[PDB]
């Protein structure tokens, strides 16, 4: 087949030496890479920018005439990634080279056969501060109709985290927005954990770290991200080939999803970043 889906809760992606490069989630769809050798035991695949090998034991062949394969499509205003059959995210503005309502396929969401996208927030250095003030960040809750969020009116805490730890506050707001549903997930509400800190795929709720209150959750997650990712050379969101997404989450499109939120917030707040 041309496309395969991940069967177990997570599966590893390996290099040609058998070393682990990353891991991806159940249901993820990988592309067969016809430029490298596959065998009965391992398939040469590509996912979210990463070219490696996966065990056939971890995969099920798809038929693209009847099974969902992730794709990109323009509505004539924004270009969307269908990351699941019933879920799309905006990743870029419409380009004149895009046909409205036509499905496009890409292993990285950057290179398409007739156009190339810039996803600047995906690769932005997260140690550079945002140009948004605390009050500006707080305005986006009303502008995006975000109701009953634990993160409402926390712009000052995000900017304090940025000041102390040197991590972009727009990224911190976007990461917490995406991963905890704007601080409305059960992990957010029960554990003040807005960033999926130690929320491992096997037992995400039980494994998730607990923080003392909302502010200590923002600051404590920022400390954890600084110490475990930024200080270890993972300084941008990225994908399965480079950046925080290699290790932070099994979801191949975690980085793209956070970059999409950054893009949405940035547009609502007047394009200062």
- Please state the closest distance from residue 18 (CB atom) to Ca ion, in A: 8
**Nearer to Ca ion among residue 19 and residue 212 (C-beta):** 19
For position 19 contacting Ca ion by CB under 5 A, the verdict is: yes
- Please state the closest distance from residue 19 (CB atom) to Ca ion, in A: 4
**Nearer to Ca ion among residue 14 and residue 115 (C-beta):** 14
Tell me which residues in 146-185 interact with Ca ion (CB under 5 A): none
Tell me which residues in 237-266 interact with Ca ion (CB under 5 A): none
Q: What are phi and psi of 21, to 5 degrees?
A: -95, -40
Instruction: Using the rule CB under 5 A, give the single segment among 11-19, 130-138, 169-177, 245-253 that binds Ca ion.
Output: 11-19
d(CA 86, CA 242): 27
- Please state the closest distance from residue 25 (CB atom) to Ca ion, in A: 23
**Nearer to Ca ion among residue 52 and residue 238 (C-beta):** 52
- Please state the closest distance from residue 47 (CB atom) to Ca ion, in A: 18
For position 18 contacting Ca ion by CB under 5 A, the verdict is: no
For position 17 contacting Ca ion by CB under 5 A, the verdict is: yes
For position 40 contacting Ca ion by CB under 5 A, the verdict is: no
d(CA 183, CA 195): 9
d(CA 241, CA 58): 20
d(CA 155, CA 271): 17
For position 15 contacting Ca ion by CB under 5 A, the verdict is: yes
Q: Which residues contact 233 (CB under 8 A, 6 or more apart)?
A: none
Number of residues that bind Ca ion (CB under 5 A): 3
- Please state the closest distance from residue 21 (CB atom) to Ca ion, in A: 8
In which residue are the tokens 């070393």 written? 19
**Nearer to Ca ion among residue 21 and residue 156 (C-beta):** 21
**Nearer to Ca ion among residue 37 and residue 77 (C-beta):** 37
Cα separations in angstroms, 95 against 78, 110, 179, 253: 9, 13, 29, 22
Q: Taking a C-beta distance cutoff of 8 angstroms, is the pair 47, 10 a contact?
A: no
For position 20 contacting Ca ion by CB under 5 A, the verdict is: no
Instruction: Using the rule CB under 5 A, give the single segment among 7-15, 88-96, 155-163, 247-255 that binds Ca ion.
Output: 7-15
d(CA 54, CA 234): 24
> Closest residue to Ca ion, Cβ-based?
17
Write out the residues near Ca ion by the rule CB under 5 A: 15, 17, 19
């Amino acid at each position: 087949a041309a496309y395969y889906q991940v069967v177990p809760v997570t599966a590893n992606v390996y290099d040609s030496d058998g070393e682990k490069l990353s891991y991806i989630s159940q249901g993820s769809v990988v592309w067969l890479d016809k430029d490298r050798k596959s065998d009965d035991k391992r398939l040469a695949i590509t996912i979210s920018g990463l070219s490696g090998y996966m065990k056939t034991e971890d995969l099920q062949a798809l038929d693209a005439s009847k099974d969902f394969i992730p794709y990109y499509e323009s509505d004539g205003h924004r270009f969307y990634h269908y990351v699941a059959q019933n879920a799309s995210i905006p990743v870029a503005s419409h380009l004149s080279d895009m046909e409205v309502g036509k499905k496009y396929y890409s292993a990285d969401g950057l290179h398409f056969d007739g156009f190339k996208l810039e996803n600047p927030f995906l690769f932005k250095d997260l140690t550079e501060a945002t140009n948004y003030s605390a009050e500006e960040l707080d305005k986006v809750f009303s502008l995006l109709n975000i109701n009953n969020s634990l993160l409402e009116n926390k712009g000052a805490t995000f900017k304090e985290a940025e000041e102390h730890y040197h991590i972009n506050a727009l990224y911190l707001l976007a990461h917490s927005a995406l991963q905890s549903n704007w601080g409305r997930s059960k992990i957010a509400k029960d554990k003040n954990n807005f960033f999926g800190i130690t929320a491992y795929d096997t037992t995400p709720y039980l494994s998730a770290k607990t923080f003392d209150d909302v502010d200590k959750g923002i600051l404590g997650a920022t400390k954890w991200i600084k110490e475990n990712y930024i200080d270890r050379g993972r300084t941008f969101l990225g994908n399965k080939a480079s950046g925080m997404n290699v290790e932070y989450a099994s979801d191949p499109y975690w980085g793209e999803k956070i970059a999409s939120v950054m893009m949405k917030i940035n547009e609502k707040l007047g394009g200062k970043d």
